[PDB]
Amino acid sequence: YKLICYYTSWSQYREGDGSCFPDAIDPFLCTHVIYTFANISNNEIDTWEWNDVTLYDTLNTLKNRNPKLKTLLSVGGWNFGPERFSKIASKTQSRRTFIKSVPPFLRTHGFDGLDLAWLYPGRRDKRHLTTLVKEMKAEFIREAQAGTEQLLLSAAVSAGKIAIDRGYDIAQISRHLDFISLLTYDFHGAWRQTVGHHSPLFRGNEDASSRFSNADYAVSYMLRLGAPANKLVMGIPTFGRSFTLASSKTDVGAPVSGPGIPGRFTKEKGILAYYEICDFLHGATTHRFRDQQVPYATKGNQWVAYDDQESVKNKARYLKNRQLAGAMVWALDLDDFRGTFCGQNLTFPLTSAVKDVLAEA
Numbered sequence: 384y385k386l387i388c389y390y391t392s393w394s395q396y397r398e399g400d401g402s403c404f405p406d407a408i409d410p411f412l413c414t415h416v417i418y419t420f421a422n423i424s425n426n427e428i429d430t431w432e433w434n435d436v437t438l439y440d441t442l443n444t445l446k447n448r449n450p451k452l453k454t455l456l457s458v459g460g461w462n463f464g465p466e467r468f469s470k471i472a473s474k475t476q477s478r479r480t481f482i483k484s485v486p487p488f489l490r491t492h493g494f495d496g497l498d499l500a501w502l503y504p505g506r507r508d509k510r511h512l513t514t515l516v517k518e519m520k521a522e523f524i525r526e527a528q529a530g531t532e533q534l535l536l537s538a539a540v541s542a543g544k545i546a547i548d549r550g551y552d553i554a555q556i557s558r559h560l561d562f563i564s565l566l567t568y569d570f571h572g573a574w575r576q577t578v579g580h581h582s583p584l585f586r587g588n589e590d591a592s593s594r595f596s597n598a599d600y601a602v603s604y605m606l607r608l609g610a611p612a613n614k615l616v617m618g619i620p621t622f623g624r625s626f627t628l629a630s631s632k633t634d635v636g637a638p639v640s641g642p643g644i645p646g647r648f649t650k651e652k653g654i655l656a657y658y659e660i661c662d663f664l665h666g667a668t669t670h671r672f673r674d675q676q677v678p679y680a681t682k683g684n685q686w687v688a689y690d691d692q693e694s695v696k697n698k699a700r701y702l703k704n705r706q707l708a709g710a711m712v713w714a715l716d717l718d719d720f721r722g723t724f725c726g727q728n729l730t731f732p733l734t735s736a737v738k739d740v741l742a743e744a
């Protein structure tokens with residue numbers, strides 16, 4: 384099985400214990416670590432943070448300890464606007480410029496591949512994404528002739544049915560990608576004025592939005608569209624999502640007034656790192672959505688949907704049972720990488736739980 388793990392370049396800036404640099408990563412934890420994100424400038428791949436060349440080096444020094452570890456560089460993300468991707472991919476010339484720029488940059492910086500994180504292709508982009516993936520793969524095939532192991536090509540893909548239908552030719556891109564990471568953790572609609580879980584494995588008992596907004600639906604749909612199981616990797620989050628409650632009610636359908644207050648370290652309303660959630664749990668009441676097989680917790684006027692050791696193990700068993708290629712974790716810097724917040728004196732408790740289950744049989 385693959386265990387694909389993202390590290391985000393902006394996590395270095397977090398205050399105190401929130402600060403995460405690539406040398407915090409256990410070299411034997413994941414099979415693939417993906418650094419996010421690279422920029423595209425002058426139609427060519429490029430660095431983003433002022434110190435990316437240094438951090439790339441810190442990440443790739445992990446291979447000294449684990450020579451089998453593979454690293455990839457992810458281009459795109461939400462800061463990079465999807466409009467920028469569309470412009471590049473939609474013209475033969477700009478597409479070529481971008482593709483040609485990729486292998487030399489990856490080789491210079493010691494990466495084993497490229498991950499495409501276009502968030503997200505629209506209806507007008509579907510055919511252009513197919514050509515980008517096919518042509519990029521063709522370039523990697525050419526570059527391998529020069530003697531070095533062929534660069535890998537992956538993509539992070541929406542797990543939402545509507546977004547999938549709108550923007551991706553799954554049958555075609557699956558042929559050329561070495562793996563597809565499904566973003567199976569963005570299932571709670573931003574329009575919803577009630578609490579709800581963003582990463583449920585199965586649908587909930589009543590009033591769900593779509594019997595589509597769950598990981599099992601997304602996995603089945605991708606297989607149905609022609610992605611081979613051995614190309615699909617199921618995403619598992621190490622962050623949770625938070626809401627401010629609008630009333631004393633906390634169970635299914637509880638009204639909310641907006642996102643939860645920011646975490647002390649991650650400082651973004653509506654999201655919390657797992658290490659922040661571990662602390663939040665002190666004094667909180669814990670519940671589990673039976674049917675959806677994922678937990679939530681609440682205290683005060685705050686309500687948090689999240690994944691714990693039990694839920695990530697459960698998802699790992701699920702993806703093995705569906706004979707998928709493995710799991711993807713977003714993100715290492717949001718797990719308890721220090722090992723000091725979750726009361727087990729264990730680094731990367733969520734990611735390690737997934738790893739341990741993948742090894743079982």
Ligand SMILES: *[C@@H]1O[C@H](CO)[C@@H](O[C@@H]2O[C@H](CO)[C@@H](O[C@@H]3O[C@H](CO[C@H]4O[C@H](CO)[C@@H](O)[C@H](O)[C@@H]4O)[C@@H](O[C@H]4O[C@H](CO)[C@@H](O)[C@H](O)[C@@H]4O)[C@H](O)[C@@H]3O)[C@H](O)[C@H]2NC(C)=O)[C@H](O)[C@H]1NC(C)=O
Nearest residue numbers: 421422423424425426427428429430431432433462463467
């Ligand atoms: C990720 O990559 C993106 C894409 O490359 C980066 O964004 C780019 O950043 C550069 C540098 O800041 C910026 O360049 C700008 O260039 C203009 C000149 O524009 C010319 O063309 C214009 C047509 O639209 C025309 O109107 C103009 O006359 C020019 O001919 C600069 O304009 C000033 O130039 C001088 C010197 O700076 C000034 O003295 C003068 O007063 C002008 O006002 C701008 O100041 C910029 O330098 C790109 O425009 C920008 N591209 C996009 C699409 O956003 C980005 O930095 C990178 N991110 C990270 C995190 O690395």
